[PDB]
Amino acid sequence: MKFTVEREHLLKPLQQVSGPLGGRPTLPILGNLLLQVADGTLSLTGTDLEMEMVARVALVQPHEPGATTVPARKFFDICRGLPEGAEIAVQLEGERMLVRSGRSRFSLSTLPAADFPNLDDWQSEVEFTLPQATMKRLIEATQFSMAHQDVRYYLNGMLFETEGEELRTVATDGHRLAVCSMPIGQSLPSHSVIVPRKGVIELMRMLDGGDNPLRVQIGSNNIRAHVGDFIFTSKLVDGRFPDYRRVLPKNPDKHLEAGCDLLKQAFARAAILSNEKFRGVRLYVSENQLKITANNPEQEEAEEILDVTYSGAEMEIGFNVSYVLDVLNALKCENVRMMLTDSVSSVQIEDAASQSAAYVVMPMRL
Amino acid sequence: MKFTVEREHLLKPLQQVSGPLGGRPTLPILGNLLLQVADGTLSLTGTDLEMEMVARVALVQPHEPGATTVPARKFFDICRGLPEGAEIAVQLEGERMLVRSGRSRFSLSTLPAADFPNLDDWQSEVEFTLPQATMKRLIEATQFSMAHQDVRYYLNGMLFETEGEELRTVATDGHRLAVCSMPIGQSLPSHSVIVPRKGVIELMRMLDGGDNPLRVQIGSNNIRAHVGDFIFTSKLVDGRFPDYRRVLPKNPDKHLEAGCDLLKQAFARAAILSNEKFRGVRLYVSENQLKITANNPEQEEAEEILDVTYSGAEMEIGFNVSYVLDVLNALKCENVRMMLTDSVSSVQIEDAASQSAAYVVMPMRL
Ligand SMILES: CCC/C(=N/OCc1ccc(-c2ccc(F)cc2)cc1)[C@@H]1C(=O)CC(C)(C)[C@H](C#N)C1=O
Numbered sequence: 171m172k173f174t175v176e177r178e179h180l181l182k183p184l185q186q187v188s189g190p191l192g193g194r195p196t197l198p199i200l201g202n203l204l205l206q207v208a209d210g211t212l213s214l215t216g217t218d219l220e221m222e223m224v225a226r227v228a229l230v231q232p233h234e235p236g237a238t239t240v241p242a243r244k245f246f247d248i249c250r251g252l253p254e255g256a257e258i259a260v261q262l263e264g265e266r267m268l269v270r271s272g273r274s275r276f277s278l279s280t281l282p283a284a285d286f287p288n289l290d291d292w293q294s295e296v297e298f299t300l301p302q303a304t305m306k307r308l309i310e311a312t313q314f315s316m317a318h319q320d321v322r323y324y325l326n327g328m329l330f331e332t333e334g335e336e337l338r339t340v341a342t343d344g345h346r347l348a349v350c351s352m353p354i355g356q357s358l359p360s361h362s363v364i365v366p367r368k369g370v371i372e373l374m375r376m377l378d379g380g381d382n383p384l385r386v387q388i389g390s391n392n393i394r395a396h397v398g399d400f401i402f403t404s405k406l407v408d409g410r411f412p413d414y415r416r417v418l419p420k421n422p423d424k425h426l427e428a429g430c431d432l433l434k435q436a437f438a439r440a441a442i443l444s445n446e447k448f449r450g451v452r453l454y455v456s457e458n459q460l461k462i463t464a465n466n467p468e469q470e471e472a473e474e475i476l477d478v479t480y481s482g483a484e485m486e487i488g489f490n491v492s493y494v495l496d497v498l499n500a501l502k503c504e505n506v507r508m509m510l511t512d513s514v515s516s517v518q519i520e521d522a523a524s525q526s527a528a529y530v531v532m533p534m535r536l
Numbered sequence: 537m538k539f540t541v542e543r544e545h546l547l548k549p550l551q552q553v554s555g556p557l558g559g560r561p562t563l564p565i566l567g568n569l570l571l572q573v574a575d576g577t578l579s580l581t582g583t584d585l586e587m588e589m590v591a592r593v594a595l596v597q598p599h600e601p602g603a604t605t606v607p608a609r610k611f612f613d614i615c616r617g618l619p620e621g622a623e624i625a626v627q628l629e630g631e632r633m634l635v636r637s638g639r640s641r642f643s644l645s646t647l648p649a650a651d652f653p654n655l656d657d658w659q660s661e662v663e664f665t666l667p668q669a670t671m672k673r674l675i676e677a678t679q680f681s682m683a684h685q686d687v688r689y690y691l692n693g694m695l696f697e698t699e700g701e702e703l704r705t706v707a708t709d710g711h712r713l714a715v716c717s718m719p720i721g722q723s724l725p726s727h728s729v730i731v732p733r734k735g736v737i738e739l740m741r742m743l744d745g746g747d748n749p750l751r752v753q754i755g756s757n758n759i760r761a762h763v764g765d766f767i768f769t770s771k772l773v774d775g776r777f778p779d780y781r782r783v784l785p786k787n788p789d790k791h792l793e794a795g796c797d798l799l800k801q802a803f804a805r806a807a808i809l810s811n812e813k814f815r816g817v818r819l820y821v822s823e824n825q826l827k828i829t830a831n832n833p834e835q836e837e838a839e840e841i842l843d844v845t846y847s848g849a850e851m852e853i854g855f856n857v858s859y860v861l862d863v864l865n866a867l868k869c870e871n872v873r874m875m876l877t878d879s880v881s882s883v884q885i886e887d888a889a890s891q892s893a894a895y896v897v898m899p900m901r902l
Pocket residue numbers: 342343344345346347411412413416417516517530531532
């Protein structure tokens with residue numbers, strides 16, 4: 171195995187493939203990148219066993235085929251530390267990989283490419299393309315609502331649901347929920363999968379700002395995304411995800427509208443004086459006005475009053491303020507609508523001007 | 537106690553008096569800031585007992601004298617979270633402090649200002665003034681060479697020395713040394729003090745880019761710096777410090793000169809393949825050449841060769857590359873000079889074009 175490539179054709183591919191990978195991944199070969207030369211292409215692969223990232227770079231200079239595995243971080247640091255415009259010559263020599271540029275020479279130890287972890291071939295069942303921007307939307311809008319290390323492994327992930335001509339994401343906690351759907355201009359079978367925590371991260375990470383569309387393929391136990399010359403594959407989470415349709419409030423006929431930024435700053439200042447563990451705030455809704463109060467064990471107290479649009483009956487409702495701020499932070503819009511039923515029922519929050527996404531939050535007893 | 541102040545007049549002083557790496561209190565009252573209104577000025581004071589930071593803010597609106605102490609981080613978060621241009625009215629009310637602006641109200645818990653730790657009055661013995669830029673130069677030039685938790689506790693600080701019309705800093709950890717002197721245009725007594733690590737941190741963080749000069753006063757056991765309406769005071773470290781003059785190599789009659797950036801990048805690449813704990817690299821110097829090699833336990837190896845200016849005898853010398861890189865990063869010059877004696881003696885490194893700062897590093901046996 172040999173190749174010579176310009177440093178700058180190596181930088182992004184390298185950064186993109188080291189994104190997976192554990193902490194001494196306890197499996198040391200997981201700290202290595204699999205390098206493969208075949209045809210006129212160098213392929214770079216990283217994996218953490220659950221997912222795998224692959225980049226292709228075209229070889230215009232003379233090359234010889236073969237494969238090896240090298241420590242990912244060190245090979246990246248070498249390449250990155252060389253001067254702009256450096257030509258990097260790489261050759262596999264016995265149990266070492268030799269890198270030379272200019273009058274700099276480096277030998278890295280290798281692990282055999284035969285030993286590198288290989289996700290099994292699988293069959294795609296649903297395939298679609300969509301703008302990168304739309305995947306970013308769908309992820310941003312819901313990520314913050316996934317569980318973290320919940321016993322219910324499937325809540326630690328994000329549901330991806332194809333339905334009609336839309337792709338939808340759904341994330342929940344057991345306490346708060348987010349869902350977002352976006353039209354994609356393709357007629358799709360109905361299909362639901364759960365993408366793990368690390369895999370949604372990696373998906374997001376692949377997105378770059380350019381005109382490369384995202385090409386997706388889903389199988390029974392895998393998802394794959396291809397943008398440009400990178401391809402990301404993840405295992406799926408095997409469990410049944412709750413139905414968002416069952417979670418959305420049934421009869422939320424009391425509707426409050428308010429400026430997003432004023433609401434979020436009023437909640438953010440109150441939070442300062444809410445209990446650091448439980449974060450409870452109390453909302454008093456009355457004609458055209460909202461009052462937010464917070465208190466803590468030290469007996470400290472905040473109160474915020476703002477003008478809002480509200481015609482229904484007066485009610486008092488407690489919320490974990492972090493749940494509320496998370497939603498208001500992800501909405502990024504002029505005005506917000508909160509849809510309320512009673513003091514004992516969940517509330518729905520969305521952009522006053524869009525039904526793309528919906529957030530549901532369980533009130534707190536208090 | 538009562539005052540009304542514009543928010544943007546509180547923001548900077550608040551930030552300056554809340555002095556970082558003390559996130560974990562000790563005594564509770566230490567987590568509070570001391571507010572005092574007297575003679576038309578609000579004074580705000582933070583302390584960890586070893587040091588104290590005081591800001592004064594002129595009060596043009598009606599105000600009423602008195603003092604209290606409030607949770608530092610909460611009062612800051614409250615003021616910062618209010619809207620641009622907010623007027624903040626504060627009044628002390630029982631065992632609570634009432635903060636109100638617009639239609640936001642807050643009540644914070646207090647502890648008696650009578651209880652707040654006082655640092656005792658002490659008398660200055662040396663006083664001088666000097667530009668912030670020159671204090672910044674002095675600290676950045678040497679700070680990185682301070683010890684961390686060495687048993688020889690005086691090494692964990694920085695020496696500030698007045699001599700002639702210069703102020704000098706020195707820092708050393710027993711393995712490497714930095715010294716920097718800058719002229720200050722005042723004739724001063726010869727005097728030496730050790731500033732503790734946290735005090736040098738606070739001295740640096742009070743430098744703002746402005747041309748409020750530092751007014752410095754040193755007593756037997758304390759240092760004080762006054763910049764604008766901010767006054768910082770620290771205990772001194774009571775011990776005797778190594779004489780740098782001792783440590784400077786006897787006479788190093790082999791001089792190597794090289795471009796700083798080319799040298800630092802060759803060392804930075806090599807270090808990748810050095811031992812992660814001991815970080816040894818070898819230097820072979822030869823007519824107009826330097827060769828740097830590194831290896832690690834897995835038997836990986838880096839070589840760098842570059843052109844330099846060098847006429848003396850060939851030599852091999854081993855160094856901890858992190859020490860060497862620290863120096864090259866702190867010198868921010870075009871060319872550097874290394875001053876060598878033999879394989880078992882320390883090297884001195886400086887700007888080839890300036891003698892302002894000197895760095896001494898002891899060789900390692902590889
Ligand atoms: C064996 C699977 C058990 C289930 N697991 O779902 C976990 C789960 C439960 C509740 C929420 C939730 C989210 C937001 C909210 F405002 C109120 C509740 C989110 C997730 C069911 C479920 O699938 C239907 C359900 C209506 C979500 C039901 C409730 N409540 C359940 O507990």
